[PDB]
Design a protein around this ligand. Sequence first.
Ligand SMILES: CC(C)C[C@H](N)P(=O)(O)O
Ligand SMILES: [Zn+2]
Length: 864
Amino acid sequence: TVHYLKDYQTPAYHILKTDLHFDINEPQTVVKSRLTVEPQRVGEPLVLDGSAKLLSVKINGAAADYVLEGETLTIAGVPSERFTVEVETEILPAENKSLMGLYASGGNLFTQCEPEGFRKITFYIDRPDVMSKFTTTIVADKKRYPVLLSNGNKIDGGEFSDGRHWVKWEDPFSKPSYLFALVAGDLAVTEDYFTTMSGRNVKIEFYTTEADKPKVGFAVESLKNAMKWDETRFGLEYDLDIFMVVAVGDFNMGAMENKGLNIFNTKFVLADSRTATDTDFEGIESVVGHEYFHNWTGNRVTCRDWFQLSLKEGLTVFRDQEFSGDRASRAVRRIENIRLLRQHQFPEDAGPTAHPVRPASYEEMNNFYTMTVYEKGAEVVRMYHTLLGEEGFQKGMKLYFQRHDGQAVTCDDFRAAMADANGINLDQFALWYSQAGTPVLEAEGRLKNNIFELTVKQTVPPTPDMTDKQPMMIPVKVGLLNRNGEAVAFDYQGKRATEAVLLLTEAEQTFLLEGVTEAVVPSLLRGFSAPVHLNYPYSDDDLLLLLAHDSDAFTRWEAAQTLYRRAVAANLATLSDGVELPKHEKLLAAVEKVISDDLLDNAFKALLLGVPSEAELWDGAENIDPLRYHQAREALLDTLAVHFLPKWHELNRQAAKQENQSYEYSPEAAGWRTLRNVCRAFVLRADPAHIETVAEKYGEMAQNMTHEWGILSAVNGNESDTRNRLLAQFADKFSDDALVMDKYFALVGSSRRSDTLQQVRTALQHPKFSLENPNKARSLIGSFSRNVPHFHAEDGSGYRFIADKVIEIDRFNPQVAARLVQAFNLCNKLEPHRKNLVKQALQRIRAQEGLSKDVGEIVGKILD
Ligand SMILES: CC(C)C[C@H](N)P(=O)(O)O
Ligand SMILES: [Zn+2]
């Protein structure tokens, strides 16, 4: 059964009011609903989605004539005017290991409804174009469940003689079912507030365990920053006098934007310097912002159907990116976002599971919360901003909300708003939503007369969903550098400037940059103006010049990235010919200049010193031996480590002094620590024995989690017993902090050491490990699945291990399993031996009785 976008049809029924009543007992919870249903197409049967135990169903107080089949409840004869439906269901939250619907965690109850989890609570028209006004009543034992939360305003509540108490929540904003939330349990609260631009106080309440409460401070501040920023940048104001955030340790995703009651994975809300890295802090800031920004881009305006997921996700990611960029280090953080895209989204677009930003079909919608919908989706939204500028973009946002506030709409509606608000045609831009695959740009430069003539051709490869690909609208931002590396002015188009956005709209175009009175090297795709591969015949010297002198952060970084890529390509060639490694003279020269350049921003310097991942390196390759690519990359890192060993120390000490004992989080101090941790990584592969010196003064250097993690990461591949000891001491010191134990299992799973597989298998039985906890499963098993030398081991042990865990995990959590099985996505691009073994593994997963729809869909894409 496949769902198709082209088959969309408006619902035959609307739900106007949704009154819910929760009776929480041990072990079961009884849900009583009362829906006010309004016919849209009179005469049609009422179809309700649902998978919970059905106890009773009524139409207007009378027992209904119905049939239950699969997860569908049908009532043939329903009135032609407004009527009530009353469904009574029973749930066993403690048995819910899928972490979808109503489930237990840490003795408390939580919900996760997006995309289609609400049907697991009650029978409902569970689709996002059906919006209803919710009133939620909750009854439970007061001692066990003192805190009872749902969307909106608490308007009533009371006590019963027998120890139970109740509450009543009213969400006045019509919403789809996927934004419903309920929380019941014993939780500590952190209180604060934000006053809106119109003088209205908004009560802020963060709910966590008693012990985790001290770690929620940074998240509260980030929210208040996010609330202020949305006002100042977008003119968007919060619309309730209460905003609640709940932390939960068992959670499939990062966080959830349920209206006025966000539910967060602990990893994106808890932090202190002692237990969280600077990266963790930045993560909290991004995600807290993200979930708050959904209140307008997702909740006030929602999705007509789930094919439109990127409408709220691409747009909201773009917003949290701009939020983070406005806070600090925009350039550095832009590179990070670009790096993430090329390292995870590009592989996806090149693989068997490739899909457009707006899919045309899906079997299981949970499989499409992907890098493509999110990150490429953001890049698509960012291109509007590039084409229109900030003011023009905000004009689109204004008209978007003017038209569609309180509606469930599509990506086309967003595009129309951008188009109409600025009086511009964006018909061709629609292809960014419908055409999958990474576009490839072939560029040629020619200076004849006094005009730099830039030819550019685009090509979009076929993908499993679509062969035909038409030319797309691709903004290419460009500049010119002379022999000395200073910006050269040119005329385009009737305007003399130092920078221009060349709009490529067809298969091949030539752009005329006139008024060029000297030799130039072009700077291309500045700021990563479009999500594409660009090929230009740069000399190594051209790259040295761009890296050294160009004014755009990305192009400088990309120039360094290109030199690294070429170096690894050389290593591959020599290792293949059974010959000495290359010398990499021009590369080593560049790295030396980077290391010694005191003018480079510390964090930007760290990025320039990062080598592209194996996935980037074998991009577009056939018959891949992942270990040869691994060997070639490792060889380059060894060369850089050993060659610059004393300067790594020097840079290390420089960073230590500039940090200046400022161990709490700040973008400034974090920049030095990032650079410090790069140096440690290089030092400790050049001189592994240095670990004992580090171990000797561990307590001295373990001044925050950034330092501990940085040190443990640097030594994680060390074959010394000291590596194991430090890991064991780490687990002991932080045994009580679940989020830090995640870091422990990540180190175990990711180690380059020869004995990683058996250490991983021992870790499975660690008292603090739980396969049923998504964070733990990802940390240990996810990391191993990405551990190239071990996952792609020749004997196939990595394949068999991961396949076993996919099978095992899928028995209780298909979402984690479906994510994990995508470690096999490289199947058909592997050399014959490994490909055979991967197919065997995939066949074995497929042969499982009761295999989830989630995993089945993915395995299908790879095998069939
Ligand atoms: C599926 C769900 C929990 C993801 C949220 N919509 P996010 O994209 O805001 O994390
Ligand atoms: Zn989101």
